[PDB]
Amino acid sequence: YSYTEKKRIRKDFGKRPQVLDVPYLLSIQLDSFQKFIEQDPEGQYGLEAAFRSVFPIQSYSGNSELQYVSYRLGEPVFDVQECQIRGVTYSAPLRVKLRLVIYEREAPEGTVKDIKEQEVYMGEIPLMTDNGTFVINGTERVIVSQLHRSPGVFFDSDKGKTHSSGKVLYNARIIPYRGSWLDFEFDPKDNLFVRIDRRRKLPATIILRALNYTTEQILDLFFEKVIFEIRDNKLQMELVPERLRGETASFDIEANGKVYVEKGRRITARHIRQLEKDDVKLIEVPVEYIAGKVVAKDYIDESTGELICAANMELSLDLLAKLSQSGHKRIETLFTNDLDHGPYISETLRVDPTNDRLSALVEIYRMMRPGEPPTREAAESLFENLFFSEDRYDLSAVGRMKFNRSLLREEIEGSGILSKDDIIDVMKKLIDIRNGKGEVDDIDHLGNRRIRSVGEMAENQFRVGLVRVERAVKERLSLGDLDTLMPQDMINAKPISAAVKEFFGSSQLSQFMDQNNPLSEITHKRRISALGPGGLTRERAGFEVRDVHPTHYGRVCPIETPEGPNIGLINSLSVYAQTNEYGFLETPYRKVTDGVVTDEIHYLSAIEEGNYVIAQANSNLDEEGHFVEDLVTCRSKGESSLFSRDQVDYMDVSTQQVVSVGASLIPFLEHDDANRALMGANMQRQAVPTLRADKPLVGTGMERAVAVDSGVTAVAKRGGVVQYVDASRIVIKVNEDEMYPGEAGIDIYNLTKYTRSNQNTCINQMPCVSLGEPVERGDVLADGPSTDLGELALGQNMRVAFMPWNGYNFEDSILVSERVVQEDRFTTIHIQELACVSRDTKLGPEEITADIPNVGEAALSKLDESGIVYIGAEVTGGDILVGKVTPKGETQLTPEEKLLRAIFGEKASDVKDSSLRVPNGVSGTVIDVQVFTRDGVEKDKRALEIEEMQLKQAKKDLSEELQILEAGLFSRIRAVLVAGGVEAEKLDKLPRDRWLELGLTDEEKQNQLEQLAEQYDELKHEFEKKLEAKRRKITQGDDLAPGVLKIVKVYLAVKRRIQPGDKMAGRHGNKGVISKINPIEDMPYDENGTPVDIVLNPLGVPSRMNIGQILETHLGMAAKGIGDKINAMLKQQQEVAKLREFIQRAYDLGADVRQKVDLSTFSDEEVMRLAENLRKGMPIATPVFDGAKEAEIKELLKLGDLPTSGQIRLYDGRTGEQFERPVTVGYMYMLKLNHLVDDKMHARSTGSYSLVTQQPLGGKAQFGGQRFGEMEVWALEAYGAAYTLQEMLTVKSDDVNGRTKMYKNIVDGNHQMEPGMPESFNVLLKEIRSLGINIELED
């Protein structure tokens, strides 16, 4: 048992043995971006791939080519926190080596000149930090992966809804990665139509003729020949017997003079068998059975040569006679059996108006670019670039793969462009599906939906930028003479950077990181949106794609998805899901050989999983991978059923594997209805981190992986011993075996102290280790926000009681004791940042001094001499944070104000007040002030002081680096210096620098000393250069937005306490708005007088079937019972052995339990530390569907001397008489969601109004009023309330003059209204008149 595990072991119920541990939860983001920017010594997807795609760029035969060599991501100028502070993207420059070869003109291919450009800069690309987040403008963003319809070809039905006659209209659709679409379809008349991307509909054969297939060749492609002979009498016919399946005979079909089939009967298998026996080849056929047929090829009148009948012509007795007499012994026809072989292509060719190749090109042209006259060459070029140009059409690697897979081809890698055979095979497959020998595909099948992560999407945008650079480059290459120009004048960095920065800043998929948990972040990064470019829309689609498909199992959580209008379109990734080489989701499975369940895990995609028969993870096995049963439950081909013990092929790798991380964190999930669990996951990812997170008593064992994999904690990178722990840093003296040879050193971790989230919450790390403790690799050193001891801790353990209490928990509402707010258990910290900007006006610059007119020294109390606020100031609403005045002129005040200024000598000042003041209602502490100034502007005192603070801090930080680093280094120096002789006096006494030139015994001693000598000189230069550069960073100016002088940002810290109105929620979708802070002596209380902390309404449990919260409540009661027993044993200071016995008994008490507590902990120290960590309650773990059964909960309760029924007897704190029917008390994990009430309560009387319409609006903490939309107007009309309605839409909103008359009347004590006319109506009039329409009031 690791040391950090010895700290507090979570009793793990759950019996199935874990065989595959949870992967790195952010591997999706990190791996995708790794693919993007990484030196790839071949064309595998990546930056290199885009380059190799577009380059080399060769002129328009100008014998001047621009070719690409290699690239190199420069170092980022700023650090991550540096960017977050200065508000700049955290990016790296993209240096690229190019070569411009000017060939030798006037002779065969030959290079005369080649300028190899010194790495043309061509933009910056935003790097991804160590958690899959980009810093784009100081704000962390996240690029959601996209789930989009894979390239390839798909065959759909379009069933039922056509021609009110059933008649499913089978259609096919080629979808490329980049390039135009290509659809084929059937009409009710069975006419195969084509349509390029979405245009008019054309008869399919057009494109066939386009590919230079003459009608003869077409029929030879889509049909089998039927031969007819005229063997000296009456139109014989060659015949193969299977061609005759399912027909009605028209003549005696007799060979060898012996009748086999009778004219007019249904063929039997024995009929065909007769035929196979006789080997019947040629049968004499009457001339009328050749009436309805259709000639295949073209037959001419060879007696004269001229034509006879066109190919694809239905023969007639006349034509029979003509072909006979002209000498055609052999006659071809199309085999068109309306059962198998529909005559579809024939009928189309008939509808096909064109005949030749060129006319076909012309028709395509007229459909594509209607209106312009069709040039021959233009038609050709359009059609070639349409589907077969490298430049304008790319299926993909994956496109080609899925394509060949759909056409049952064997090869996987092909070409990126289509080809003739491809289109033909698509048409054949479609025709087959129409014949019945094939099935359409379901679009929802996760074997057709691919995953584009960040790496791929950014690569696509970068490819876009590259192609526009190529445009401009070829343009320049063709124009001038090229000796003088070098390969960095051609190439602009504005367009590439434009494309990329656009994708990263303003895109549907780049979103502000949802940052109020570790869980919220880690679930934002595993999001799978179906929206975004090339995806669906929240209103286009669509009742169908939203539903969970049997293919989601193990790949996409079925319960974690938003509840609004994009239900089913967000789909958090599942826990063990991965991404195929092509981007198809695949999940692990244990390979089941004959009967023994092995442990090699194969990752299966959707289609692979479709074949085999996979067993559930809850199938009992016996120490030998043997299914203990005879028939076991499995899922086979989209369905579940029992199967022979010797039938399965794979087994689910674990029982958590179908849910996401969010859902796998709900204990007793399998007891909650799916709706309530959906709400529970969605709200659990909204908890705001409290003042001091604790742990969940009832967890699911997955808290640790989430808390660690999200980078909110400081995790040890090398084992060692904590040499110095501090509220702001942790210094680890690494172990020897983990050290590198040189650079012995130590490991420093600087914690993130109180800082802003994106949701204005305080992210802030506390060290959980203590001095001299030993730590191992991958161990948790500093608990981030909302984690405790490395376990995710979103909420608090509340003593809850289920009972109705005077209606205060009437609906979902909650009733909270006062002890909960006294202890500040749900008190959260919120940090706002308010920025005052000093812009340059046209009337003169603005000033930040404290010279602000007519605000008493009560107002300028807390401003320092320079006009900024003092750090540490407790401020409140309205107080001046940053005093700022702006120049102002042209008073032109009314006569009465002039008389005022006269009688009182009040000089009407010229500087208007525009200072930055605290918004109302928020009352916090100023905890930070930053000041940026445009360089050139002279700094004020306060900016210089902050600069001095920063400069001191940076000097001291670099000093601490080199100081304590050489402290460890000097420890090792004297360690190696006892070697080469243990020189005590003359070696220690010498100044620690008197070793650069001294000489020791020629072993690693002198070796290390000279190593540290290089270290010494080069690190001296390091310290000088680096302190210089950091001092330059500090003292330099900042690139402010053009026009501004200086920005001052002030950070307020607010300690929001809970209060009636805030929303709270357990983990099972039991929401609730707290409604009364009850005094302690009122809360119910048991025989020991402990009051309950929260009184939940029982009525919420039956209807909403989340019966999981009851189980969690009982198990929590049990856990806290163990904790109370151990706390009691610990207050008597009983002994170690008593505690050891009891704790051990607690850690057993189950059957087939997988907790596997070592039972060999440090006899006294570790056990006592444990018990100290358990006196608050023994943390339980309940894996999702491998839960803890009731009976185990009852046993845990008996172990703690608590009623196994889980219900105790209570007394009413108000009267002290007992409630009958014992109630359910327990401990529930309650989160406080960030729908805080003091961020909801707005109200206005009058404020600012809109500009064009004169209606209310605000953002300035006096928002607009509430919207009084249509439905409210209908409500007021449904009452007879005409006057209310009138004043609502005339004086309260729009009447620019009536509203002020109303105000003046209100203050005058006279409540009356003058209606006038709403300004919005005048606006509507003017906008009608501004059409050609004369609208006017009449009288």
Binding site: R366, R369, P370, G371, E372, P373
Partner: peptide, 13 residues
């Protein structure tokens, strides 16, 4: 004529 409304087309034609 292809009943086109794009004036660019009309001018170029």
């Amino acid at each position: 004529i292809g009943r086109t409304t794009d004036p660019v087309r009309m001018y170029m034609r």
